[PDB]
Design a protein around this motif. Sequence first.
Motif, PDB file in Angstrom:
ATOM      1  N   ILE A  38       6.195   0.383 -11.725  1.00 41.07           N
ATOM      2  CA  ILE A  38       6.139  -0.633 -10.335  1.00 41.07           C
ATOM      3  C   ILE A  38       4.673  -1.160 -10.460  1.00 41.07           C
ATOM      4  O   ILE A  38       3.619  -0.087 -10.297  1.00 41.07           O
ATOM      5  CB  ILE A  38       6.241   0.512  -9.298  1.00 41.07           C
ATOM      6  N   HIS A  39       3.978  -2.394 -10.134  1.00 40.71           N
ATOM      7  CA  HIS A  39       3.302  -2.609 -10.338  1.00 40.71           C
ATOM      8  C   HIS A  39       2.630  -3.251  -8.854  1.00 40.71           C
ATOM      9  O   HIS A  39       3.205  -3.989  -8.070  1.00 40.71           O
ATOM     10  CB  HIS A  39       2.865  -3.831 -11.350  1.00 40.71           C
ATOM     11  N   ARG A  40       1.614  -2.960  -8.508  1.00 35.25           N
ATOM     12  CA  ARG A  40       0.697  -3.012  -7.026  1.00 35.25           C
ATOM     13  C   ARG A  40       0.234  -4.277  -7.096  1.00 35.25           C
ATOM     14  O   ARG A  40      -1.606  -4.010  -8.249  1.00 35.25           O
ATOM     15  CB  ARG A  40       0.683  -2.110  -6.723  1.00 35.25           C
ATOM     16  N   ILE A  77       5.443  -5.709  -7.011  1.00 31.34           N
ATOM     17  CA  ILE A  77       6.051  -6.291  -8.078  1.00 31.34           C
ATOM     18  C   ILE A  77       6.547  -5.235  -8.449  1.00 31.34           C
ATOM     19  O   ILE A  77       5.986  -4.061  -9.002  1.00 31.34           O
ATOM     20  CB  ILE A  77       4.280  -6.386  -8.980  1.00 31.34           C
ATOM     21  N   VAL A  78       7.909  -5.240  -9.196  1.00 33.40           N
ATOM     22  CA  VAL A  78       8.866  -4.182 -10.581  1.00 33.40           C
ATOM     23  C   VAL A  78       8.864  -5.238 -11.447  1.00 33.40           C
ATOM     24  O   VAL A  78       9.646  -6.134 -12.177  1.00 33.40           O
ATOM     25  CB  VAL A  78       9.861  -4.201 -10.306  1.00 33.40           C
ATOM     26  N   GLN A  79       9.043  -4.363 -13.015  1.00 31.29           N
ATOM     27  CA  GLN A  79       9.174  -4.365 -13.575  1.00 31.29           C
ATOM     28  C   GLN A  79      10.949  -4.674 -13.742  1.00 31.29           C
ATOM     29  O   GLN A  79      11.183  -2.984 -13.960  1.00 31.29           O
ATOM     30  CB  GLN A  79       7.752  -3.943 -15.216  1.00 31.29           C
ATOM     31  N   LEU A  80      11.217  -5.012 -14.676  1.00 26.97           N
ATOM     32  CA  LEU A  80      12.857  -4.817 -14.822  1.00 26.97           C
ATOM     33  C   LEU A  80      13.061  -4.516 -16.813  1.00 26.97           C
ATOM     34  O   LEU A  80      12.341  -5.908 -17.264  1.00 26.97           O
ATOM     35  CB  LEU A  80      13.787  -5.792 -14.616  1.00 26.97           C
ATOM     36  N   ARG A  81      13.870  -3.882 -17.548  1.00 30.09           N
ATOM     37  CA  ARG A  81      13.989  -4.261 -18.413  1.00 30.09           C
ATOM     38  C   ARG A  81      16.182  -4.701 -19.328  1.00 30.09           C
ATOM     39  O   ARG A  81      16.410  -4.487 -17.993  1.00 30.09           O
ATOM     40  CB  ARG A  81      14.160  -2.860 -19.220  1.00 30.09           C
ATOM     41  N   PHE A  82      15.889  -5.692 -19.836  1.00 26.69           N
ATOM     42  CA  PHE A  82      16.810  -5.458 -20.250  1.00 26.69           C
ATOM     43  C   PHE A  82      17.712  -5.056 -21.879  1.00 26.69           C
ATOM     44  O   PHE A  82      17.281  -5.151 -22.463  1.00 26.69           O
ATOM     45  CB  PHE A  82      17.758  -7.865 -19.850  1.00 26.69           C
ATOM     46  N   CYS A  83      18.875  -5.351 -21.773  1.00 24.28           N
ATOM     47  CA  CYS A  83      19.684  -4.511 -23.491  1.00 24.28           C
ATOM     48  C   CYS A  83      21.093  -5.519 -23.259  1.00 24.28           C
ATOM     49  O   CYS A  83      21.251  -5.884 -24.604  1.00 24.28           O
ATOM     50  CB  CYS A  83      20.196  -3.683 -22.988  1.00 24.28           C
ATOM     51  N   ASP A 126       0.910  -0.816  -0.085  1.00 22.21           N
ATOM     52  CA  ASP A 126       0.312  -0.264  -0.184  1.00 22.21           C
ATOM     53  C   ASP A 126       1.373   0.975   0.067  1.00 22.21           C
ATOM     54  O   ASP A 126       0.800   2.286  -0.548  1.00 22.21           O
ATOM     55  CB  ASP A 126      -1.068  -0.054   1.402  1.00 22.21           C
ATOM     56  N   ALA A 127       2.621   1.135   1.003  1.00 26.07           N
ATOM     57  CA  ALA A 127       2.892   1.847   0.391  1.00 26.07           C
ATOM     58  C   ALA A 127       3.573   2.982  -0.595  1.00 26.07           C
ATOM     59  O   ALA A 127       3.186   4.275  -0.875  1.00 26.07           O
ATOM     60  CB  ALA A 127       3.944   2.088   1.721  1.00 26.07           C
ATOM     61  N   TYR A 128       3.664   1.714  -1.186  1.00 28.32           N
ATOM     62  CA  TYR A 128       4.043   2.411  -2.784  1.00 28.32           C
ATOM     63  C   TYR A 128       2.821   2.604  -3.833  1.00 28.32           C
ATOM     64  O   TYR A 128       3.651   3.434  -4.939  1.00 28.32           O
ATOM     65  CB  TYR A 128       4.367   1.173  -3.570  1.00 28.32           C
ATOM     66  N   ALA A 129       1.614   2.706  -3.029  1.00 30.52           N
ATOM     67  CA  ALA A 129       0.615   3.025  -3.968  1.00 30.52           C
ATOM     68  C   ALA A 129       0.677   4.463  -5.006  1.00 30.52           C
ATOM     69  O   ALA A 129       0.730   5.100  -5.107  1.00 30.52           O
ATOM     70  CB  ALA A 129      -0.941   2.819  -2.879  1.00 30.52           C
ATOM     71  N   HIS A 130       1.468   5.609  -2.771  1.00 27.97           N
ATOM     72  CA  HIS A 130       1.729   6.889  -3.552  1.00 27.97           C
ATOM     73  C   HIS A 130       3.171   7.312  -4.495  1.00 27.97           C
ATOM     74  O   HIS A 130       3.956   6.265  -4.811  1.00 27.97           O
ATOM     75  CB  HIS A 130       2.255   7.349  -2.225  1.00 27.97           C
ATOM     76  N   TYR A 143      12.132   4.855  -6.749  1.00 27.70           N
ATOM     77  CA  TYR A 143      12.725   4.218  -8.000  1.00 27.70           C
ATOM     78  C   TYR A 143      14.081   4.595  -8.035  1.00 27.70           C
ATOM     79  O   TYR A 143      14.637   3.881  -8.393  1.00 27.70           O
ATOM     80  CB  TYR A 143      12.088   5.556  -8.828  1.00 27.70           C
ATOM     81  N   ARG A 144      14.971   5.289  -7.256  1.00 25.02           N
ATOM     82  CA  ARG A 144      15.722   5.281  -7.068  1.00 25.02           C
ATOM     83  C   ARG A 144      17.265   4.452  -5.916  1.00 25.02           C
ATOM     84  O   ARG A 144      17.556   3.791  -6.339  1.00 25.02           O
ATOM     85  CB  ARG A 144      16.238   7.142  -6.523  1.00 25.02           C
ATOM     86  N   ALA A 145      16.028   4.249  -5.692  1.00 23.89           N
ATOM     87  CA  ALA A 145      16.633   3.057  -4.418  1.00 23.89           C
ATOM     88  C   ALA A 145      16.780   1.755  -4.697  1.00 23.89           C
ATOM     89  O   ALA A 145      17.757   1.216  -4.972  1.00 23.89           O
ATOM     90  CB  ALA A 145      15.856   3.169  -3.050  1.00 23.89           C
ATOM     91  N   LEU A 146      15.942   1.567  -5.707  1.00 23.62           N
ATOM     92  CA  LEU A 146      15.522  -0.134  -6.539  1.00 23.62           C
ATOM     93  C   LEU A 146      16.882   0.121  -7.779  1.00 23.62           C
ATOM     94  O   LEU A 146      17.901  -0.513  -7.798  1.00 23.62           O
ATOM     95  CB  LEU A 146      14.491   0.390  -7.114  1.00 23.62           C
TER      96      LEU A 146
END
Length: 169
Positions: A64-66, A72-78, A30-34, A42-45
């Motif tokens: 960031i998906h709640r 849930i956090v979506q990550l990208r690769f390259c 719930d805290a990540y909802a804001h 975002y910066r911490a991760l």
Amino acid sequence: MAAGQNGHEEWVGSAYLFVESSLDKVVLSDAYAHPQQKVAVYRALQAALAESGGSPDVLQMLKIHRSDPQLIVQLRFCGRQPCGRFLRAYREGALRAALQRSLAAALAQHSVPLQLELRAGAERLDALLADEERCLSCILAQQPDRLRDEELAELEDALRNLKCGSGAR
């Protein structure tokens, strides 16, 4: 130095990560909802990924998906180089989480067991530790979606200018 035709070498995909403290008395998701918390997180991760080999230039968070009592956090690769460090460092990060639980009582927490899980297809975190090649097939099997993350891309781009690591002096 051999060369001739132009190679394409395209390796990019999306992965889902679940972060939870294994505690039912605190609703962390719930805290990540804001929105402000999402950006601060975002910066911490982003900094945490650098330790595991997920630099903000090769690995970035699409959004960031709640859902349910988990985050849930979506990550990208390259780049493949930082990709191998991402999964190898993931196992080390889980071991570090166990240390936090013991340190919780030592500092000022009854218990804060945190863990990360990977869901890229039909294989879970335990299914990716054995074979590393398979994790790429699952992550690359799913294509990313910037249609709904256009605003997030600008937010992370603005964050890059604010941060100035690697000083000339």
